[PDB]
Structure formats: C-alpha cells, structure tokens
Paper text:
Here, we report that a T6SS effector TseP, from Aeromonas dhakensis, represents a family of effectors with dual amidase-lysozyme activities. Our previous findings have established that TseP serves a structural role because its expression can restore the T6SS secretion in the Δ3eff mutant lacking all three effector genes, and the C-terminal domain, TsePC, possesses lysozyme activities. However, the function of the N-terminal domain, TsePN, which lacks any recognizable conserved motif, has remained elusive. This study unveils that TsePN is capable of cleaving the peptide link between NAM and L-Ala as an amidase. TsePN, the N-terminal domain, functions as a Zn2+-dependent amidase, while the C-terminal domain, TsePC, exhibits lysozyme activities.
While testing TseP-mediated hydrolysis of purified PG from Gram-negative bacteria, we noticed that both TseP and TsePC displayed more efficient digestion than the commonly used hen-egg lysozyme. To further investigate this, we determined the X-ray crystal structure of TsePC to a resolution of 2.27 Å (Rwork = 0.189 and Rfree = 0.227) by molecular replacement with one molecule in the asymmetric unit. The crystal structure revealed that TsePC comprises a smaller lobe of seven helices and a larger lobe of ten helices, separated by a concave groove. The surface electrostatic potential of TsePC, calculated using the Adaptive Poisson-Boltzmann Solver (APBS), consists of both electronegative and electropositive regions, unlike the predominantly electronegative groove of lysozyme. The electropositive surface of TsePC consists of residues R723 and K796, with an adjacent residue Y720 corresponding to W62 in lysozyme, altering which is known to affect substrate binding. Additionally, the previously predicted catalytic dyad (E655 and E663) was located near the groove. Although this structural arrangement resembles that of other lysozyme family members, TsePC exhibits a less compact conformation with a notably wider groove compared to the typical lysozyme. Previous studies have shown that the lysozyme possesses catalytic sites at E53 and D70 in the substrate-binding groove, while the active residues in the TsePC structure are E654 and E663, respectively. To test the effect of E663 for TsePC activity, we purified a mutant E663D (TsePC-E663D) protein and perform PG-digestion assays. The results show that TsePC-E663D lost the activity, suggesting the greater distance within the groove requires this glutamate residue.
Author numbering: 5 to 246
C-alpha cells in the first residue's frame, strides 16, 4: 500500500488503533483514484485529517443553548462581537430572531441550521424555508458544508470513481460513512481547494502554509505540526520545524 497502518496510527498520535484499522482501506483506495502518490503531501494530508477528525467521521452539532446560538450565529462580525454581560450584539444583531424568536431556534438543530446557514454567499444554500441550511451542515473528516460543497463533491467523487456513482445532494448523510468521509477528504484536498494549490503547497511547503489553506486560519497549528512530524518519522522523511 501507499499508506500503512503505522502512518495512520502515527497521525492519530498513537491512539485508537482500531479506528485507524477501520479507515485504512478507504485511505488507500481513494489515494489511488484521486492521485495521492507524493509522500510529503500524504504526511500533510494524514496530519491535517487526523487533527480535524481523529479518523472518525463527524457531523456538525447544531443543538445550541439560547445564549450559545446568539454568541456564535447572532452578531454582526461573528462571536467576537457577542457581549456576554448584556447577552447582546456589540455592533448589530445579524440574526435578530435568535433574540425575538429564541424558543424556536434554541435546542432545535433543524430550525437553527435552516436559519443561520440560509442564503450564505457563495454557498448556494437557499432561504430558511428551503431546508438547505440544516441539510448541508458540516460532515466528514475535514468537514464540508453548504449546498455548493455537496454539488462539487458529487461531481468530483463520480469523476475519480466512475464505477461507484453517488449523489450526495440526495444522500448527504453518506459522508458520515467511513468510505465517503474518506472520499470527501481527498476531494477537499485535490479539488475543493485546487485554486489555493493545497496539494502543491503540501509538496514543497510548510505545515503553517498547509494549515492556512485547510483552516482559513491557524487553529490547532501546533497539533497539526506534531502529527506531521510523527508521520514523517514513520515514513523516513524530513520532519518540519514549521
């Protein structure tokens, strides 16, 4: 194989061996069909996937308390503008129904997701009554979210795996299976972020630079680097100081 159990276990910080064993065949199947051949890129991929997911598929949790949903989804400019003391937005309520229609959205993942992800720019989600917001919530290993990602994953997975045609608009929960969570990770890597040259950057770049593309930021940077070096060691590749 291109990916051994020891690489996956190392990317998983030597935890949950059986989760690593369960996902190993899909990891190898889709590295072949999507074209993961380069070893330094693979070490970045395993370390980024391991940090995001620990190789277990995850679905976004949209069950929030009243204050919790206001903090994360209610304020213009995001949570940085939540005033905990006032339970209010510092620079304007972006989603005012989280205040006036509190009981409709708190602890109601379907209603909340349909409201807070409605009409998101670039996302192809329709309005609150379309059901797009909850339906295309985050799923996978590196989570993909919103209608646009599920369109693009459908086309990308079918292009790379023509003998296993799927429709993740019709069946979005399949991304919670190990098989299509793994396919979606490779789609993220090679297709979804192609315009940022994620794969190229992993080939000759830095953990920090890979992290910037994957995360849109530097969240969990130190842990992603720790995982990469552990993978580099098992492979025989130079580690990374950055």
């Amino acid at each position: 194989d291109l990916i051994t159990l020891e690489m996956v276990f190392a990317a998983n910080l030597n935890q949950d061996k059986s989760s690593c064993e369960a996902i190993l065949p899909f990891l190898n199947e889709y590295a072949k069909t999507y074209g993961m051949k380069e070893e330094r890129a693979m070490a970045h991929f395993l370390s980024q996937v391991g940090h995001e997911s620990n190789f277990k598929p995850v679905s976004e949790n949209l069950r929030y308390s009243p204050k919790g949903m206001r903090k994360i989804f209610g304020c213009k400019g995001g949570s940085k503008n939540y005033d905990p003391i006032l339970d209010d937005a510092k620079e304007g309520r972006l989603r005012p129904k989280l205040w006036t229609h509190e009981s409709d959205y708190a602890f109601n993942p379907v209603a909340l997701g349909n409201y807070v992800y409605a009409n998101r720019p670039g996302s192809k989600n329709g309005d609150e009554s379309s059901g797009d917001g909850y339906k295309y919530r985050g799923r996978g290993l590196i989570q993909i979210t919103h209608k646009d990602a599920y369109i693009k994953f459908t086309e990308a997975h079918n292009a790379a795996n023509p003998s296993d045609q799927k429709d993740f608009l019709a069946s979005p929960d399949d991304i919670l299976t190990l098989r299509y969570a793994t396919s979606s990770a490779y789609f993220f890597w090679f297709i979804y972020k192609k315009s940022f040259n994620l794969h190229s950057t992993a080939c000759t770049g830095t953990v920090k630079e890979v992290t910037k593309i994957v995360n849109g930021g530097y969240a969990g940077y130190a842990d992603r680097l720790k995982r990469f070096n552990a993978v580099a060691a098992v492979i025989g590749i130079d580690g990374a100081r950055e």
